[PDB]
Design a protein around this ligand. Structure first.
Ligand SMILES: [Cl-]
Ligand SMILES: [Cl-]
Length: 129
């Protein structure tokens, strides 16, 4: 599923992401835009053999099992394919675990490079929330 901007904002808010660990909703929408272009089916292979999955591009070396990343930890205890669903629940619950592990949203390279320090509220402006 390719989400609309406000559609995704509302879904993330419903799943408890607004101000989760102090990160306003606009941060999460900005990270999804630049990680996946709002596409739940996005995948990207990395040089170390890991693959990033779904709307928030969660990595198979630490967080989910895709059966082809040796030494995977599978800390969210989910098959990576579950992160590609049209229902973002699995991606949200896993991202809540990621953003709590110490480095905050810096775990998402695109958030660090393209959202951090910007006016992220612009990503939810105009939306009926
Ligand atoms: Cl915001
Ligand atoms: Cl933080």
């Amino acid at each position: 599923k390719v989400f609309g901007r406000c559609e995704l904002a509302a879904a993330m808010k419903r799943h408890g992401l607004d101000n989760y660990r102090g990160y306003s909703l606009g941060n999460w929408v900005c990270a999804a835009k630049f990680e996946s272009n709002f596409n739940t089916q996005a995948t990207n292979r990395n040089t170390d053999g890991s693959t990033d999955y779904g709307i928030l591009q969660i990595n198979s070396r630490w967080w989910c099992n895709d059966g082809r990343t040796p030494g995977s930890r599978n800390l969210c205890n989910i098959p990576c394919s579950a992160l590609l669903s049209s229902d973002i629940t699995a991606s949200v619950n896993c991202a809540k675990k990621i953003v709590s592990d110490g480095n905050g949203m810096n775990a998402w390279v695109a958030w660090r490079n393209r959202c951090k320090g910007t006016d992220v509220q612009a990503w939810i402006r105009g939306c009926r929330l």
